[PDB]
């Protein structure tokens, strides 16, 4: 036993008022196959995919802590066997480990909400009307409680379709601490679960590849080697900084967790901050060479104005940038040659700069007429003059549909930036300025080509420096493709670039991380 | 099964480009001359191993025009992206040691284009006299 | 406590039919817990849930009455029985999970949801009594062999839920835990065998010699005091005095103490109208074996410090009366922008300043250094100007650790500099020729050395020996601190590389 | 009893693995005299000469707290009777009172090191 007993050890499964429920005895005569699951799964508990939660003193009463629905997605086994079979039945047993410090208070309530109940609000007045259990956030032992299967069809299908007896809890009366100094003990929870007496799968089908319960695999490659998603350059260090604007809307390196692209994120690593176009070279007695570029997708397919605010891979910063172009001029003896053009983004007081419509412009200070024949060509950048990490004029000055800003963060969470530096042409100082994405290009090309199924709201990550083997921070990953990290300092904070981001478990939005 | 034969870089951006510590001087002939000491593009040092060159080093012959960021010590100019003319093939006269980590580059400038030493990555701007044979 | 889902596992009843003898154990070992010193850990409020506190494998190495008793026998077979003591008071909270990983498993990182899918116990950090649990022997061969580190059931202990406690201004309340382990009822040894001493269970014992007598490793001169200096470069890449604890010889380190800073070669003397009598030595290893350009940056014993030094060479002069004579030469080591000193290829150019055409004769030569000039503790040009495969720089130290030095002094010609600044090495040669002459097996990452005075007995500090061949020392001062040079190094145990020493 | 029991009350002599040991029954036929010590010394415990020690948070692990050798110098009586007689035998029972505040942690280990063991490091 522990020491001591100024805690409250609820070891008993509280009496829930609900009859027993038959499991795989109503699907035996209607699933034409015998099946059993390895009898050593029924023996030890084990953490669910969604295992973790936190009850921080800021959480008001009524905030649903963990709302987990009965199904095969409640073990690491039962969610990895359920890629072969098609359908399940039967009960389950869920533990609940919340053993907060002996200087806390406040109580939670767990309510076996039945099927066919409208998801949504479930306020603190109608969480006790269900068959519930009240337990204190100081409870020492694990608090077992059942998760029966109330249904009207024999065996559910193993696609997320069906509706089953959710088991939602609620921070009934808030957690408040009692220790005499400058600290409130966030109680972390855990969730272990094992299939009940007669859980069982039904029909045996091929273990399809793109199944529905793939947890997540983040690519095992160091951020030092990955490629940035806003400039054709490697990643040179990741860091957190509250000083910079903490809600940008970069239109590059912006992918959901389940692969759905957002805005103007290319899929290549070379399509980044560049574009292909049908050129139109002409000359006039002012600056010289003028190119009226008609935009087109970098692969060759024709551009069309759509929901995204530019062709795939168009640069989403502001400032003057130079451009390299392979042109075939008519001058004899020198036919093929790469030349450098210049293009200014953002308002210019002479701005038919409509990357959304499909027209942009470039100007080279040529004395004579650069006799260049028009032709399809791509344009890779070489240097930026007036860098400003803001949206350029995607129309002339008009409105254009684009990706929402990166948010929202909890109180005290900062965006975790993968930072690179770009070539700079300036005159005064010699500090090459920095741009930063939310996910390196490998992560985009990975999520776009896997199409996982996001479970609740976020993936709790980690950072294991492989050389020594110690953790570095505990960062949370929202589904909108940004990595929020809890942080409190004023100046920036840079991390080493040898870690391997490894997914840990699903987690709701309200998870109060560990500060750094 | 994952093994990386040859000198293939992992990032899709390291391809055909290399980072190096620069050392510019100005001979009174061809012009500026930079003696890049090669370094793995992520920053870590280089040692002669069993791959032909640092990760991402190009494997096609021909005089290659690189585009590189540099800083000058003149007046009114602080940063500037310039170009160079590197020779990749045997060229019959070059103390080029991509295996040992020393590569020459030059321009055509009669004046003394003074540039301060530093660390620079040479992305390829253009090719000339291409051949699909190992340099 | 010890209620985990694992069938009983048989030993010494499954490998008796195919083992000649089945030897027993002094039965006063089955009644005494003992600690394997890599089985210690210290949770702290700043540890994210998921770290691995201790990860240790079943074997006879967990119980020094077995790591020693396993020099007389050929093979062991059977179970063990371990227990874990967590030293926390009743105002803390936060669980810890112990898992019995089976003996064929891709090592690496186990996130806190993969450590609980195993068989496992969970226990709080408020448990007085030890958390007993068994370490069965899941194997596939009948009985393991003692001279063969083969895989066996491992214990992994993971911080499941972070620690939540108050803490004063000093020193932030670590919850320390320890592990102990004794043989189960049927852990038997198999075949008796004459006791060979160099079995692979041996704490790496250091020679009992005061650092004031040991021969230095980079310049042929005795050690003249050891010190710590956080101001000097904290990650040098000297190419001599570089030996891993497990025997290998990194860099150009020679196994003698007399090969240091001096090379042997075939000399080629020729006169010039300028500097006079120049010489182009084609290198060779001193003992006589031919030299080939390999993975080390130079022949064994070549210097690793930039600066001009003169060499002393016997030259069989063909003059009349002066047949044999030892003369001084002059050689430049640094780059100096004009020098064809290519040791990596095997060519070193050393000259003199003489006006006469004194007719030397070529032949074998060994060149002892005489005096440095313009010393620079940086690499000479091992190639013409190219790179060369050399030893990696010493490191890396934990935050709050500085390299230990072994400073010697060297001859030096100058004009105004009077203070004899000079070189230092990582380990005196009496340690290099001692780690290469035993081939100790290395347990984890670093030994817990201890520098005890020989007569007073009182400690001086606790240096940590990183097996990559250096000695880190926990320190926070600003200036170079100097230590007495008449103590004795002595080992204590192995220790995880995350160990934190006692500041001095 | 005290108040309360967020402490850990080890009242039991832990089981040490060592056989009993005969005391003054191996010296009765080879010391030509009858002797006994006042039977009221065997009744109450009493502080040794070396009685006190302190475990401060600065003490690292491994610092020997109290290394006391069996002999007559472990009572104020047995060290004041042992100025008459010449020689002793036999066992002894030692208490150990360490009852730190209920807000502490950390553990000590006591080891009955046998004779003829080289003093020093341990």
From Swiss-Prot, chain A:
Gene3D superfamilies: 2.60.120.20, Positive stranded ssRNA viruses. Residues 1-210 are annotated as: Shell domain. CDD domains: rhv_like. Residues 211-516 are annotated as: Protruding domain. Keywords: Host cytoplasm, Virion. Residues 403-516 are annotated as: P1 sub-domain 2. It is found in: Virion; Host cytoplasm. Residues 264-402 are annotated as: P2 sub-domain. Residues 211-263 are annotated as: P1 sub-domain 1. Residues 284-352 are annotated as: Interaction with host receptor CD300LF. Its main location: virion. InterPro entries: Calicivirus_coat (IPR004005), Calicivirus_coat_C (IPR013643), Rhv-like (IPR033703), Viral_coat (IPR029053). It holds the Pfam family Calici_coat. GO terms for cellular component: host cell cytoplasm; virion component. Homodimer. Homomultimer. Interacts with the minor capsid protein VP2. Interacts (via P2 subdomain) with host receptor CD300LF (via N-terminus); this interaction requires Mg(2+) and Ca(2+), and allows viral binding and entry into the host cell. Stochioimetry is 2:2. Bile acids interact with the P domain dimer interface and act as cofactors enhancing virus binding and infectivity. Interacts with host receptor CD300LD; this interaction allows viral binding and entry into the host cell. Belongs to the caliciviridae capsid protein family. Capsid protein self assembles to form an icosahedral capsid with a T=3 symmetry, about 38 nm in diameter, and consisting of 180 capsid proteins. A smaller form of capsid with a diameter of 23 nm might be capsid proteins assembled as icosahedron with T=1 symmetry. The capsid encapsulates the genomic RNA and is decorated with VP2 proteins. Mediates virion attachment to the host cell receptor CD300LF. The shell domain (S domain) contains elements essential for the formation of the icosahedron. The Protruding domain (P domain) is divided into sub-domains P1 and P2. P domain interacts in dimeric contacts that increase the stability of the capsid and form the protrusions on the virion. An hypervariable region in P2 is thought to play an important role in receptor binding and immune reactivity. This is Capsid protein VP1. It comes from Norovirus (isolate Mouse/NoV/United States/MNV1/2002/GV) (MNV-1).
Curated annotation (Swiss-Prot), chain C:
It is found in: Virion; Host cytoplasm. InterPro entries: Calicivirus_coat (IPR004005), Calicivirus_coat_C (IPR013643), Rhv-like (IPR033703), Viral_coat (IPR029053). Residues 199-251 are annotated as: P1 sub-domain 1. Residues 199-504 are annotated as: Protruding domain. Pfam families: Calici_coat (PF00915), Calici_coat_C (PF08435). Residues 1-198 are annotated as: Shell domain. Residues 252-390 are annotated as: P2 sub-domain. The keyword Transmembrane helix does not apply. Keywords: Host cytoplasm, Virion. The keyword Transmembrane does not apply. GO terms for cellular component: host cell cytoplasm; virion component. It comes from the Viruses. Residues 272-340 are annotated as: Interaction with host receptor CD300LF. Residues 391-504 are annotated as: P1 sub-domain 2. Homodimer. Homomultimer. Interacts with the minor capsid protein VP2. Interacts (via P2 subdomain) with host receptor CD300LF (via N-terminus); this interaction requires Mg(2+) and Ca(2+), and allows viral binding and entry into the host cell. Stochioimetry is 2:2. Bile acids interact with the P domain dimer interface and act as cofactors enhancing virus binding and infectivity. Interacts with host receptor CD300LD; this interaction allows viral binding and entry into the host cell. Capsid protein self assembles to form an icosahedral capsid with a T=3 symmetry, about 38 nm in diameter, and consisting of 180 capsid proteins. A smaller form of capsid with a diameter of 23 nm might be capsid proteins assembled as icosahedron with T=1 symmetry. The capsid encapsulates the genomic RNA and is decorated with VP2 proteins. Mediates virion attachment to the host cell receptor CD300LF. The shell domain (S domain) contains elements essential for the formation of the icosahedron. The Protruding domain (P domain) is divided into sub-domains P1 and P2. P domain interacts in dimeric contacts that increase the stability of the capsid and form the protrusions on the virion. An hypervariable region in P2 is thought to play an important role in receptor binding and immune reactivity. Belongs to the caliciviridae capsid protein family. This is Capsid protein VP1. It comes from Norovirus (isolate Mouse/NoV/United States/MNV1/2002/GV) (MNV-1).
């Amino acid at each position: 036993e522990a020491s001591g007993q100024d805690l409250v050890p609820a070891a008993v499964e509280q009496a829930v008022p609900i009859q027993p429920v038959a499991g795989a005895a109503l699907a035996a005569p209607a699933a034409g196959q015998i099946n059993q699951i390895d009898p050593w799964i029924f023996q030890n508990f084990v953490q669910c995919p969604l295992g973790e939660f936190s009850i921080s003193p800021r959480n008001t009463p009524g905030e649903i802590l963990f709302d987990l629905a009965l199904g095969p997605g409640l073990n690491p086994y039962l969610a990895h066997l359920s890629a072969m079979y098609t359908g399940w039945v039967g009960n389950m047993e869920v533990q609940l480990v919340l053993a907060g410090n002996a200087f806390t208070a406040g109580k939670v309530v767990v309510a076996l909400v039945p099927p066919y109940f409208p998801k949504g609000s479930l306020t603190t007045a109608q969480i006790t009307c269900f068959p519930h259990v009240m337990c204190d956030v100081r409870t020492l032992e694990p608090i077992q409680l059942p998760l029966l299967d109330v249904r009207r069809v024999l065996w559910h299908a193993t696609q997320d379709q069906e509706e089953s007896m959710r088991l939602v809890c609620m921070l009934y009366t808030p957690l408040r601490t009692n220790s005499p100094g400058d600290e409130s003990f966030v109680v972390s929870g855990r969730l272990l679960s094992k299939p009940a007496a007669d859980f069982n799968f039904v029909y045996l089908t091929p273990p399809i590849e793109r199944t529905i319960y793939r947890m997540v695999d983040l690519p095992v490659i160091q951020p030092r080697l990955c490629t940035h998603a806003r400039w054709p350059a490697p990643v040179y260090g990741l860091l957190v900084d509250p000083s910079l604007p903490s809600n940008p809307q970069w239109q590059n390196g912006r992918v959901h967790v389940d692969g759905t692209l957002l805005g103007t994120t290319p899929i290549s690593g070379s399509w980044v901050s560049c574009f292909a176009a049908e050129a139109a070279y002409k000359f006039q007695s002012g600056t010289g060479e003028v190119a009226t570029f008609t935009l087109i997708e970098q692969d060759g397919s024709a551009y069309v104005p759509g929901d995204r605010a530019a062709p795939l891979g168009y640069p989403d910063f502001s400032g003057q940038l130079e451009i390299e172009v392979q042109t075939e001029t008519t001058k004899t003896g020198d036919k093929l040659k790469v030349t450098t053009f210049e293009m200014i983004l953002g308002p210019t007081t002479n701005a038919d700069q409509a990357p959304y419509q499909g027209r942009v412009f470039a100007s080279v200070t040529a004395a004579a007429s650069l006799d260049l024949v028009d032709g399809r060509v791509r344009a890779v950048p070489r240097s930026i003059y007036g860098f400003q990490d803001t949206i350029p004029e995607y129309n002339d000055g008009l409105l254009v549909p684009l990706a929402p800003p990166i948010g929202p963060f909890l109180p005290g969470e900062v965006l975790l930036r993968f930072r690179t530096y770009m070539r700079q042409i300036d005159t005064a100082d010699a500090a090459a300025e920095a741009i930063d994405c939310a996910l390196p290009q490998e992560f985009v090309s990975w999520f776009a080509s896997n199409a996982f199924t996001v479970q609740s709201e976020a993936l709790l990550l980690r950072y294991r420096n492989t050389l020594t083997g110690q953790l570095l921070f505990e960062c949370k990953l929202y589904n909108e493709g940004y990595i929020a990290l809890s942080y409190s300092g004023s100046g920036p904070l840079t991390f080493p670039t040898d870690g391997i981001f490894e997914v840990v478990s699903w987690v709701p939005r309200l998870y109060q991380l560990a500060s750094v």
